[PDB]
Design an enzyme around this catalytic site. Structure first.
Site, PDB file in Angstrom:
ATOM      1  N   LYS A 211       0.791  -1.283   0.025  1.00  0.00           N
ATOM      2  CA  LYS A 211       0.024  -0.007  -0.163  1.00  0.00           C
ATOM      3  C   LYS A 211       0.976   1.435   0.109  1.00  0.00           C
ATOM      4  O   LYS A 211       0.496   1.973  -0.683  1.00  0.00           O
ATOM      5  CB  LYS A 211      -1.015  -0.155   1.152  1.00  0.00           C
ATOM      6  CG  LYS A 211      -0.545   0.000   2.582  1.00  0.00           C
ATOM      7  CD  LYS A 211      -1.255  -0.263   3.696  1.00  0.00           C
ATOM      8  CE  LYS A 211      -0.885   0.007   5.084  1.00  0.00           C
ATOM      9  NZ  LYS A 211      -0.166  -0.998   5.699  1.00  0.00           N
TER      10      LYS A 211
ATOM     11  N   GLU B 157       4.440   5.717  10.415  1.00  0.00           N
ATOM     12  CA  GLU B 157       5.072   5.012   9.728  1.00  0.00           C
ATOM     13  C   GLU B 157       6.588   4.960   9.633  1.00  0.00           C
ATOM     14  O   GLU B 157       7.151   5.644  10.895  1.00  0.00           O
ATOM     15  CB  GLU B 157       4.555   5.116   8.275  1.00  0.00           C
ATOM     16  CG  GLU B 157       3.030   4.574   8.222  1.00  0.00           C
ATOM     17  CD  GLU B 157       2.892   2.969   8.320  1.00  0.00           C
ATOM     18  OE1 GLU B 157       3.765   2.268   8.290  1.00  0.00           O
ATOM     19  OE2 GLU B 157       1.517   2.830   8.719  1.00  0.00           O
ATOM     20  N   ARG B 158       7.346   4.261   8.856  1.00  0.00           N
ATOM     21  CA  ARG B 158       8.815   4.290   9.160  1.00  0.00           C
ATOM     22  C   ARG B 158       9.498   5.283   8.905  1.00  0.00           C
ATOM     23  O   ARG B 158       9.254   6.034   7.996  1.00  0.00           O
ATOM     24  CB  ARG B 158       9.333   2.850   8.395  1.00  0.00           C
ATOM     25  CG  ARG B 158       8.382   1.631   8.553  1.00  0.00           C
ATOM     26  CD  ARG B 158       9.242   0.483   7.566  1.00  0.00           C
ATOM     27  NE  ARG B 158       8.377  -0.801   7.711  1.00  0.00           N
ATOM     28  CZ  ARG B 158       7.500  -1.180   7.034  1.00  0.00           C
ATOM     29  NH1 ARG B 158       6.842  -0.157   6.114  1.00  0.00           N
ATOM     30  NH2 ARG B 158       6.813  -2.036   7.020  1.00  0.00           N
TER      31      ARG B 158
HETATM   32  N1  LIG Z   1       3.665  -3.432  -6.682  1.00  0.00           N
HETATM   33  C1  LIG Z   1       4.480  -4.214  -6.178  1.00  0.00           C
HETATM   34  N2  LIG Z   1       5.179  -5.095  -6.848  1.00  0.00           N
HETATM   35  C2  LIG Z   1       6.170  -5.970  -6.392  1.00  0.00           C
HETATM   36  N3  LIG Z   1       6.227  -6.097  -5.254  1.00  0.00           N
HETATM   37  C3  LIG Z   1       5.529  -5.728  -4.228  1.00  0.00           C
HETATM   38  C4  LIG Z   1       4.688  -4.552  -4.577  1.00  0.00           C
HETATM   39  N4  LIG Z   1       4.175  -3.786  -3.449  1.00  0.00           N
HETATM   40  C5  LIG Z   1       4.504  -4.420  -2.649  1.00  0.00           C
HETATM   41  N5  LIG Z   1       5.338  -5.293  -2.940  1.00  0.00           N
HETATM   42  C6  LIG Z   1       6.111  -6.413  -1.944  1.00  0.00           C
HETATM   43  O1  LIG Z   1       5.536  -6.523  -0.911  1.00  0.00           O
HETATM   44  C7  LIG Z   1       6.240  -5.684   0.356  1.00  0.00           C
HETATM   45  C8  LIG Z   1       5.213  -4.795   1.099  1.00  0.00           C
HETATM   46  O2  LIG Z   1       5.221  -3.300   0.615  1.00  0.00           O
HETATM   47  P1  LIG Z   1       4.697  -2.135   1.449  1.00  0.00           P
HETATM   48  O3  LIG Z   1       4.337  -1.064   0.591  1.00  0.00           O
HETATM   49  O4  LIG Z   1       5.702  -1.736   2.544  1.00  0.00           O
HETATM   50  O5  LIG Z   1       3.282  -2.764   2.173  1.00  0.00           O
HETATM   51  P2  LIG Z   1       2.556  -1.968   3.330  1.00  0.00           P
HETATM   52  O6  LIG Z   1       2.796  -0.468   3.303  1.00  0.00           O
HETATM   53  O7  LIG Z   1       1.230  -2.448   3.174  1.00  0.00           O
HETATM   54  O8  LIG Z   1       3.550  -2.413   4.706  1.00  0.00           O
HETATM   55  C9  LIG Z   1       7.265  -4.765  -0.518  1.00  0.00           C
HETATM   56  O9  LIG Z   1       8.572  -4.847   0.306  1.00  0.00           O
HETATM   57  C10 LIG Z   1       7.614  -5.827  -1.723  1.00  0.00           C
HETATM   58  O10 LIG Z   1       8.707  -6.833  -1.450  1.00  0.00           O
HETATM   59 MG   LIG Z   2       3.815   1.137   4.613  1.00  0.00          MG
END
Ligand SMILES: Nc1ncnc2c1ncn2[C@@H]1O[C@H](COP(=O)(O)OP(=O)(O)O)[C@@H](O)[C@H]1O
Ligand SMILES: [Mg+2]
Ligand SMILES: Nc1ncnc2c1ncn2[C@@H]1O[C@H](COP(=O)(O)OP(=O)(O)OP(=O)(O)O)[C@@H](O)[C@H]1O
Ligand SMILES: Nc1ncnc2c1ncn2[C@@H]1O[C@H](COP(=O)(O)OP(=O)(O)O)[C@@H](O)[C@H]1O
Ligand SMILES: [Mg+2]
Ligand SMILES: [Mg+2]
Lengths: 471, 462, 460
Positions: B155, B181-182
């Site tokens: 997200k 967040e981070r």
């Molecule tokens: N559009 C994408 N394409 C490929 N991998 C993705 C994508 N979005 C997320 N990921 C994988 O999932 C992980 C979570 O992304 P993140 O945005 O940090 O999720 P959240 O913010 O919901 O915790 C990433 O580190 C990546 O490895």
């Molecule tokens: Mg996040």
């Protein structure tokens, strides 16, 4: 101190007030900076009163005057086509309203003798409702379903098909987004269905007491027309949010929590509101006030505290499932669970003559469809698909009562069984054009409000010759 | 003026007693803590000339009976063009160094939302580039967009792509708001902003995990206060990005307990609806200007019935739900095509082909989801020939929604491909009609255009 | 002039303080209001000569420090000849504008329950006219009947039919108690009552949804106290109909919280069993006369594990459980034949021709329910020849249970059909013997007697 007092404590939109010796329960209080309140918790020493709107302005010491008046809403014919807040003040931003009478917010519902049995249809203009789950004037019918299933779609579609039928309309936006309320205001006034319609608005930005009052204020304005002897159609959008506001009030006032953190009387909250909707006897005008409350389920969970509460209060309900909505069946009504406790009492005779068995057939067809994964059944299943295609209809295109009768006739009496299922939606469109233009028997159906031997034999022949060419 | 003394302290809440005059609610108080001063915010008036205040920073060190002074006004912030290209605090302070701000005007955090009739009705879409979104749940200019996702379903990644697609190569002003967040992401972004050169036009505000509850609560506003200024004062269209707005509502629950409020469902604050409305309704496009807000919503324990995500749904024009089932299946962006919906998806706005195709794929995917129970226990061979073709098409359509992201280029090791709205509707049409039945399903993942899908099928044959 | 004064008001719960002599529990207090008197009932003694009460009407208007007066006894009500054909409220005042009530005798609504000595072992049945019920769960003369269901399952309509069948045809008086249900339905009954001419031989007490907690609470006791009189004083046969006896408990729960009671399992009042037990034990036949109580029971979210229906079950002799699963199929009256029970279904009572077919029916239906998992996923194709027949026969009996109701002509669009115990037993017996395996299962939907069902097949 007599009809006054001072705030010894305030925060989170409530205020404990000292004094106010002879302050009555549910009395309208006046604070500095022209902000209002409402006394509810009349405790031994202090007075717990909730503040409407600008609570941040108030602080310890502020003097509070008691009006000696119950909270009341300004009601008149001047309101029509304008947007109102909880209190009655216009937020349309285009002039001001002036009323003849001032009606109270909280007020008991009519008696047993006061009412009479509902026996005149409120035509929504939706085939799948008015056919098999009909609504009458004075009835309470719930529109329940998940998020984005077409709840408000049915609400407004009803309002749209009240042009000329001479019925007042009240859309009560409770805990909605101002942005969304605007979208409603426009689409109604664009279609030209606003001038016989009112909008009461207590949006998420506004405080809980204003949300709480919104539907009670809305119905009081409805009662004005009812008492005079006019038909009204109020809509609560939605009571599931209305409840959360009352939860806010209670838990701040320190009225203890119950199931799902809701207070004791969240049934009574919606009981007294919905009961207020009724049809009065001919002795008191015969004026109605039909109510369409809305409820927002969580992943189809109807066992939840409020959804179950409201279902048991109303005179039936309408269920919307995303399993249908996504499947491409709009409006996504589940006939199985959807019922109307008034029945054919609130239907034109022509409608009863066609759309009687249609509910049962669809309920039985639903079952037999699971098995198909006898040749008499293979016929029933064929009629099943076709019935549904007719019950499917688009938004902002409500059918007249006469157009519904013919739509049900063609499929039920079996004039639709010898064509392709894909074209049945187009078939009824071209037929309604052909019948309006050539035969001119829809105007007769509308006047007669029944099916004579003539009309049935006119259809029989005028349908037969229409099948000379299929497009 | 108006100086008081601290009666009692309780973690993130402090009770102060004023002798003479008592400060109005949301007023900013200041205490002279060791070396640096601490900022508090008054909330409640208790009695005996005492007020309960939530701290904007750690209360560790505060003794009983310390001096404290009232500012009089609420927490006011440097607002205007001075803030652009600089990361700001909750208090409005610069935390990027690089001198003090060139602040001309000021404006308080707490201010009422735009009243009815000040609002404007606009229903025009804009292509994001992302296939699943542009077709099914197209975002609306001057609208409130929502990105629902569980823990680590992409997200934040999706936001970073949307800023990269929209805010990168467009003249409009931007705003970003880091909420609980981070802090890693803070530095990662600030670097990628400067090196890309978007930093100049955009403004940043941050109150991350490390920050106490009071901070994470109010940062959501300050950034919005900045975004408000541009639609009001300048009268210019601005973009607002928030990650994560849940952490604001979360902070509320941590504070609410201390304020002595009776907890509601799942130990949340009882004023969850209004506290959120008093913010969310403020994020809206007026007549004077237009704000296109895209804010991310964390779903705790993948539970959307949770009252924090549950209530947010009713503040959004378009919503994009991210499912773990989709992410786990190995498809990104992990967008649920049935649960995600937008208000704009109507013949009025998107036209005939857009709408007709969008509803058709939904009907197909719905049928795939219906039969998914039976297939799981038996198999594909059992279901009828009529269903067989719809299932095979569904699985291809589902996998076609996946596409590589420019932000996740280092991750995926593929050139992220921006697809325009007109070429997406072309693709899902051809797949639906059955003109790509000959192509395998493993030639649709992380492709983009349909032209590239067949190119991958030929690449195999070699 | 045992006068008191209000101390504090919190919605329906009003606290009052008396100068000298304190009023005992459950007795009625009056307060002067603008152009009307409000009635409060004392429940608790808080201390310092203060008592906590529950208003019998809305408390919008009450001010702190008003004159309250003690009647010194519970809510006494009119009862006797005068109440017959009159709509009464919780306080026993008329609400039909048919002149004032001039009653022969006057009872309080708070009375002791009849002891172990006072009861009598009747256990003799009567036929209803409804196939499903009198077969698998026959009702008992002067017994305790109850109708369990959710919302929209058809338990109100069922009561209406039972009145139409029993109370209309047979002699003796009856008493209907509208306890916290729809006011619309009140007028709908009152309309059918006067046209049918039953109104004269019945007394109606009401306290509907719109009424506050206190009303919905004590309204059941008013309607009960009317019926108590008719069995003891008069000595005539009485039929007590109540709808709905859940709302009594519900009203309790609303107020319970504000009376300082800690909430029990799934947020009910902690004295749920005793509160109900005090009222239910009072509804009974005795040596001096018998009453036939038919009280509908709401089932929150179709959950029978919920306390409110769970503790109620114990009190009833005959129980007619209504399943939404059956209502979803669209076959009313949607009675569950496996969950419906009666203490009168025994060799002793209904003989062995009745008892054996009743079970044999239930035995077949239980088997169908087990096999219902298989035909869903694996299908009828994968099912034994021995079981195939016990499925189709089970489906036919299931659909034959449905019959058209007189009151539900407005719904079903058919003339309602009464069926006697003899005709019912033979019909189901003939299906078991495999006679009507020729007749399709569609031919059993909403039909009176088996004679008609066999005819309908060729009719269409
Ligand atoms: N559009 C994408 N394409 C490929 N991998 C993705 C994508 N979005 C997320 N990921 C994988 O999932 C992980 C979570 O992304 P993140 O945005 O940090 O999720 P959240 O913010 O919901 O915790 C990433 O580190 C990546 O490895
Ligand atoms: Mg996040
Ligand atoms: N009969 C219909 N035909 C075609 N589309 C429809 C119909 N009814 C509803 N829709 C569409 O479904 C979408 C959702 O409708 P609506 O907003 O009324 O549902 P809702 O549950 O009230 O929404 P919310 O949950 O946001 O309050 C709308 O975009 C609308 O265009
Ligand atoms: N005997 C019956 N025949 C046909 N339909 C019935 C019958 N009884 C109930 N129903 C259906 O159920 C609805 C009424 O149920 P109701 O008596 O209100 O149940 P509840 O008291 O549980 O709400 C009607 O709208 C009708 O469609
Ligand atoms: Mg809606
Ligand atoms: Mg009922």
């Amino acid at each position: 101190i007599k009809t006054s007092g001072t705030v010894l404590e305030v925060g989170d939109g409530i205020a404990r007030i000292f004094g106010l010796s002879n302050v009555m329960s549910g009395e309208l209080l006046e604070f500095p900076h022209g902000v209002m309140g409402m006394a509810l918790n009349l405790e031994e020493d202090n007075v717990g009163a909730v503040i409407l709107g600008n609570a941040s302005l108030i602080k310890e010491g502020d003097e509070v005057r008691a009006t000696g008046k119950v909270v009341s809403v300004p009601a008149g014919e001047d309101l029509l086509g304008r947007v109102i807040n909880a209190l009655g003040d216009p937020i349309d931003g285009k002039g001001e309203i002036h009323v003849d009478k001032y009606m109270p917010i909280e007020r008991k519902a009519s008696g047993i003798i006061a009412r009479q049995p509902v026996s005149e249809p409120l035509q929504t203009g939706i085939k799948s409702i008015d056919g098999m789950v009909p609504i009458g004037r004075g009835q309470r019918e719930l529109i329940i379903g998940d998020r984005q299933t077409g709840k408000t779609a049915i609400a407004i579609d009803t309002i749209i098909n009240q042009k000329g039928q001479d019925v007042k309309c009240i859309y009560v936006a409770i805990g909605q987004k101002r942005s969304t309320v605007a979208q409603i205001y426009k689409k109604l006034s664009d279609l030209g269905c606003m001038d016989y319609t009112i909008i009461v608005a207590a949006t998420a930005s506004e405080a809980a007491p204003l949300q709480y009052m919104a539907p009670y204020s809305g119905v009081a304005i409805g009662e004005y027309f009812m008492e005079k002897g006019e038909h009204v159609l109020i809509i609560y959008d939605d009571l599931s949010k209305h409840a959360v506001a009352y939860r806010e009030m209670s838990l701040l006032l320190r009225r203890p929590p119950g199931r799902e953190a809701y207070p004791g009387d969240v049934f009574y909250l919606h009981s007294r509101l919905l009961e207020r909707a009724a049809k009065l006897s001919d002795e008191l005008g015969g004026g109605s006030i039909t109510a369409l409350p809305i409820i927002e389920t969580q992943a189809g969970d109807v066992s939840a505290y409020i959804p179950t509460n409201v279902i048991s209060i109303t005179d039936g309900q309408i269920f919307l499932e995303s399993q249908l909505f996504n499947s491409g069946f709009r409006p996504a009504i589940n006939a199985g669970i959807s019922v109307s406790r008034v029945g054919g009492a609130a239907q034109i005779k022509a409608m009863k003559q066609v759309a009687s068995k249609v509910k049962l057939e669809l309920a039985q067809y639903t079952e037999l469809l699971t098995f198909a994964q006898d040749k008499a059944t293979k016929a029933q299943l064929e009629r099943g698909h076709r019935i549904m295609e007719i019950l499917k209809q688009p938004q902002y295109h409500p059918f007249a009562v006469e157009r519904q009768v013919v739509s049900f006739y063609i499929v039920i009496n079996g004039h639709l069984d010898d064509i392709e299922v894909s074209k049945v939606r187009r078939f009824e469109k071209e037929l309604l054009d052909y019948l309006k233009a050539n035969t001119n028997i829809l105007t007769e159906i509308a006047d007669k409000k029944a099916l004579d031997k003539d009309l049935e034999e006119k259809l029989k022949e005028s349908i037969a010759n229409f099948k000379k060419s299929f497009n | 003026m108006n100086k008081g003394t601290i009666t009692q302290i309780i973690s993130a809440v402090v009770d102060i007693a004023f002798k003479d005059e008592l400060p109005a609610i949301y007023n900013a108080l200041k205490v002279k803590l060791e070396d640096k001063e601490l900022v508090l915010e008054v909330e409640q008036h208790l009695g005996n000339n005492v007020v309960r205040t939530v701290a904007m920073d750690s209360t560790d060190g505060l003794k009983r009976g310390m001096e404290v002074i009232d500012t009089g006004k609420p927490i006011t912030i440097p607002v205007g063009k001075a803030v652009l290209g600089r990361i700001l605090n909750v208090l409005g302070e610069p935390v990027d160094n690089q001198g003090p701000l060139n602040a001309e005007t000021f404006l308080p955090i707490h201010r009422e939302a735009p009243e009815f009739d000040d609002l404007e009705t606009e229903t025009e879409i804009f292509e994001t580039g992302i296939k699943v979104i542009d077709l099914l749940a197209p975002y609306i200019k001057g609208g409130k967009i929502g990105l629902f996702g569980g823990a680590g379903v992409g997200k934040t990644v999706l936001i970073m792509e949307l800023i990269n697609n929209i805010a990168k190569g467009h003249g409009g002003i931007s705003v970003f708001a880091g909420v609980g967040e981070r802090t890693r992401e803070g530095r990662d972004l600030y670097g990628e902003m400067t090196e890309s050169g978007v930093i100049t036009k955009t403004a940043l505000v941050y109150g991350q995990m490390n920050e106490p509850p009071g901070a994470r609560l109010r940062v959501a506003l300050t950034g919005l206060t900045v975004a408000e200024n541009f639609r009001d004062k300048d009268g210019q269209d601005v973009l607002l990005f928030i990650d994560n707005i849940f952490r604001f509502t979360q902070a509320g629950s941590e504070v609410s307990a201390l304020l002595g409020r009776i907890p509601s469902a799942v130990g949340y604050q009882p004023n969850l609806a209004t506290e959120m409305g008093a913010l969310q309704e403020r994020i809206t496009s007026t007549k004077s200007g237009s704000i296109t807000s895209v804010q991310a919503v964390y779903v705790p324990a993948d539970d959307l019935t949770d009252p924090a995500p549950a209530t947010t749904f009713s503040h959004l024009d378009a919503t994009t739900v991210l499912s773990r089932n989709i992410a786990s299946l190995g498809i990104y962006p992990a967008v649920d095509p049935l649960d995600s919906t937008s208000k704009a998806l109507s013949e009025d706005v998107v036209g005939k082909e857009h709408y007709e195709v969008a509803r058709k794929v939904q009907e197909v995917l719905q049928r795939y989801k219906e039969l998914q129970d039976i297939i799981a226990i038996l198999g594909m061979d059992e279901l009828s020939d009529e269903d067989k073709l719809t299932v095979s098409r569904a699985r291809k359509i589902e996998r076609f929604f996946s596409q590589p992201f420019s932000v996740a280029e280092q991750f995926t090791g593929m050139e992220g491909k921006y697809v325009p709205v007109k070429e997406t509707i072309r693709g899902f049409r051809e797949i639906l009609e059955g003109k790509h039945d000959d192509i395998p399903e493993q030639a649709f993942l992380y492709v983009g255009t349909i032209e590239e899908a067949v190119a991958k099928s030929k690449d195999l044959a070699k």
